[PDB]
Design an enzyme around this catalytic site. Sequence first.
Site, mmCIF file in Angstrom:
data_model
loop_
_atom_site.group_PDB
_atom_site.id
_atom_site.type_symbol
_atom_site.label_atom_id
_atom_site.label_comp_id
_atom_site.label_asym_id
_atom_site.label_seq_id
_atom_site.Cartn_x
_atom_site.Cartn_y
_atom_site.Cartn_z
ATOM 1 N N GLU A 1 146.575 32.009 15.708
ATOM 2 C CA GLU A 1 147.049 32.931 14.692
ATOM 3 C C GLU A 1 146.115 33.046 13.513
ATOM 4 O O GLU A 1 145.527 32.058 13.068
ATOM 5 C CB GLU A 1 148.410 32.499 14.178
ATOM 6 C CG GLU A 1 149.029 33.393 13.123
ATOM 7 C CD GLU A 1 150.494 33.066 12.953
ATOM 8 O OE1 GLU A 1 150.835 32.278 12.045
ATOM 9 O OE2 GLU A 1 151.304 33.592 13.742
ATOM 10 N N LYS B 1 146.058 34.061 9.623
ATOM 11 C CA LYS B 1 146.834 34.293 8.408
ATOM 12 C C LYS B 1 146.055 33.646 7.266
ATOM 13 O O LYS B 1 145.687 32.476 7.351
ATOM 14 C CB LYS B 1 148.272 33.741 8.499
ATOM 15 C CG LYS B 1 148.412 32.267 8.630
ATOM 16 C CD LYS B 1 149.883 31.851 8.646
ATOM 17 C CE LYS B 1 149.976 30.408 9.095
ATOM 18 N NZ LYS B 1 151.356 29.957 9.220
ATOM 19 N N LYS C 1 152.535 40.059 14.153
ATOM 20 C CA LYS C 1 153.545 39.204 13.560
ATOM 21 C C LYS C 1 153.889 39.756 12.160
ATOM 22 O O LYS C 1 153.031 39.835 11.261
ATOM 23 C CB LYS C 1 152.982 37.766 13.521
ATOM 24 C CG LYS C 1 153.766 36.728 12.719
ATOM 25 C CD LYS C 1 154.757 35.950 13.537
ATOM 26 C CE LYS C 1 154.125 35.127 14.627
ATOM 27 N NZ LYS C 1 154.035 33.685 14.311
ATOM 28 N N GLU D 1 162.135 35.311 18.527
ATOM 29 C CA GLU D 1 162.105 34.017 17.871
ATOM 30 C C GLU D 1 163.468 33.455 17.542
ATOM 31 O O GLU D 1 164.296 34.133 16.940
ATOM 32 C CB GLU D 1 161.268 34.126 16.594
ATOM 33 C CG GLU D 1 161.110 32.807 15.872
ATOM 34 C CD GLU D 1 160.190 32.899 14.684
ATOM 35 O OE1 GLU D 1 160.701 32.858 13.553
ATOM 36 O OE2 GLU D 1 158.959 33.008 14.876
ATOM 37 N N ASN E 1 160.737 28.427 16.922
ATOM 38 C CA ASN E 1 160.082 28.092 15.669
ATOM 39 C C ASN E 1 160.656 26.814 15.063
ATOM 40 O O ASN E 1 161.838 26.759 14.735
ATOM 41 C CB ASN E 1 160.258 29.268 14.701
ATOM 42 C CG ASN E 1 159.321 29.189 13.505
ATOM 43 O OD1 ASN E 1 158.699 28.166 13.257
ATOM 44 N ND2 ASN E 1 159.226 30.277 12.759
ATOM 45 N N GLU F 1 156.391 27.319 18.318
ATOM 46 C CA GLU F 1 155.758 27.806 17.100
ATOM 47 C C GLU F 1 155.902 26.868 15.913
ATOM 48 O O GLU F 1 156.968 26.272 15.708
ATOM 49 C CB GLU F 1 156.371 29.121 16.637
ATOM 50 C CG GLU F 1 156.232 30.302 17.534
ATOM 51 C CD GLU F 1 156.810 31.514 16.856
ATOM 52 O OE1 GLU F 1 158.040 31.645 16.877
ATOM 53 O OE2 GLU F 1 156.040 32.323 16.298
ATOM 54 N N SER F 2 154.816 26.766 15.142
ATOM 55 C CA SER F 2 154.757 26.033 13.885
ATOM 56 C C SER F 2 154.526 24.547 13.861
ATOM 57 O O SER F 2 155.063 23.819 14.680
ATOM 58 C CB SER F 2 156.002 26.333 13.036
ATOM 59 O OG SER F 2 156.160 27.732 12.820
HETATM 60 O O1 LIG Z 1 153.831 29.293 7.667
HETATM 61 C C1 LIG Z 1 154.657 29.385 6.769
HETATM 62 O O2 LIG Z 1 154.425 28.836 5.694
HETATM 63 C C2 LIG Z 1 155.910 30.150 6.916
HETATM 64 C C3 LIG Z 1 156.778 30.180 5.807
HETATM 65 C C4 LIG Z 1 157.934 30.968 5.827
HETATM 66 C C5 LIG Z 1 158.257 31.758 6.963
HETATM 67 C C6 LIG Z 1 157.428 31.749 8.082
HETATM 68 C C7 LIG Z 1 156.256 30.944 8.060
HETATM 69 N N1 LIG Z 1 155.476 30.907 9.219
HETATM 70 C C8 LIG Z 1 155.635 31.957 10.187
HETATM 71 C C9 LIG Z 1 155.234 31.452 11.547
HETATM 72 O O3 LIG Z 1 155.264 32.524 12.443
HETATM 73 C C10 LIG Z 1 153.988 30.517 11.580
HETATM 74 O O4 LIG Z 1 152.943 31.262 10.966
HETATM 75 C C11 LIG Z 1 153.473 30.205 13.011
HETATM 76 O O5 LIG Z 1 154.577 29.752 13.829
HETATM 77 C C12 LIG Z 1 152.396 29.103 12.972
HETATM 78 O O6 LIG Z 1 152.527 28.174 12.107
HETATM 79 P P1 LIG Z 1 151.622 27.040 11.758
HETATM 80 O O7 LIG Z 1 150.812 26.604 12.905
HETATM 81 O O8 LIG Z 1 150.739 27.635 10.778
HETATM 82 O O9 LIG Z 1 152.472 25.929 11.233
#
Ligand SMILES: O=C(O)c1ccccc1NC[C@@H](O)[C@H](O)[C@H](O)COP(=O)(O)O
Length: 247
Positions: free
Chosen positions: A50, A52, A109, A158, A179, A209-210
Site C-alpha cells: 500500500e 499512503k 482505497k 472489509e 482489518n 489488513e493492518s
Molecule cells: O493506518 C491508519 O492509521 C488508519 C487510521 C484510521 C483508519 C484507517 C487506517 N488505516 C486504513 C487501512 O486500510 C490501513 O492503511 C491498511 O490496512 C494497512 O495498514 P498498515 O500496514 O499501515 O498498518
Amino acid sequence: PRYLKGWLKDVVQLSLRRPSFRASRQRPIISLNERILEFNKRNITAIIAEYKRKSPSGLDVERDPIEYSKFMERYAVGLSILTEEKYFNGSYETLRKIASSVSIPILMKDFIVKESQIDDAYNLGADTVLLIVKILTERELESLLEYARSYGMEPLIEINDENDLDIALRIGARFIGINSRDLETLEINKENQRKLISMIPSNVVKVAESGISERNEIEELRKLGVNAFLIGSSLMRNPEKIKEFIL
Ligand SMILES: O=C(O)c1ccccc1NC[C@@H](O)[C@H](O)[C@H](O)COP(=O)(O)O
C-alpha cells in the site's frame, strides 16, 4: 450511510461531496482476487503493497509514488492506493499516474459511500475498490457491491467484528479484508482479527489488513488460512522489507 461520530462522520461527509472524475479508461480490469488465488497455487506469498503518505495514526513519509509502485511491482500481487485526501493525503491524481505506470492489479482505497466513487475508481484505472461494512447500511453495501460488479470488479469487503462478518456473508461477499485496526478508535487487536479469520468460509479469499511488520506474522497468518496480506506503514518506511516478507 450509518450513524457515525467523530473523524469517521467527517470523512464520510467529505466522500459524500467528492466531485466525480471524468476520464477514458485504457487497460481492461485485472482481477486482484484471482491473481491472489494463482499466487497461492504457485506458493508465492501474496502481499498487497500500500501507498499512503500520511495516516491518522501518525505516518508521515515522503516517497515518490511512481518509483515506489514500480519497485513493488517486482514482488507484490497488487497495490493499494489511498485516494482519501484529508487524512491520508491521497488523491485521484496519484492513482491515475500509478495506474498508467504498472501492470499489476490496483485496489483503490477510500471511504466509498456513493456510486460515483466507484465510477471514479473505474475511470482512473483501478481494478477493484474497498467497501467498509461499518460505515454503510446493509442495503447500501448490497447496492454498491452489485454496482462494482457491473464493472467486472469484485470489491474487497472489509470487516472488523462478528456483526460485520454476518452482513458480509449475507450479501454474498467473496473477497474479504479483516482489518485488525478499529477505524473509530484506531486500536489494533490481533486476537480479534484471528478469531474472525477462523470463522470465514474457506471459499472466500481472505486478506489480513493492518499492523504487519514482521515475516513471522505473515507465516502465523498464512497458517490460519489467510490468502493475502495488505501492508502499508512498514513498507512506506522501508520498501526493502518487501524482500524479507516474500521469503
Ligand atoms: O493506518 C491508519 O492509521 C488508519 C487510521 C484510521 C483508519 C484507517 C487506517 N488505516 C486504513 C487501512 O486500510 C490501513 O492503511 C491498511 O490496512 C494497512 O495498514 P498498515 O500496514 O499501515 O498498518
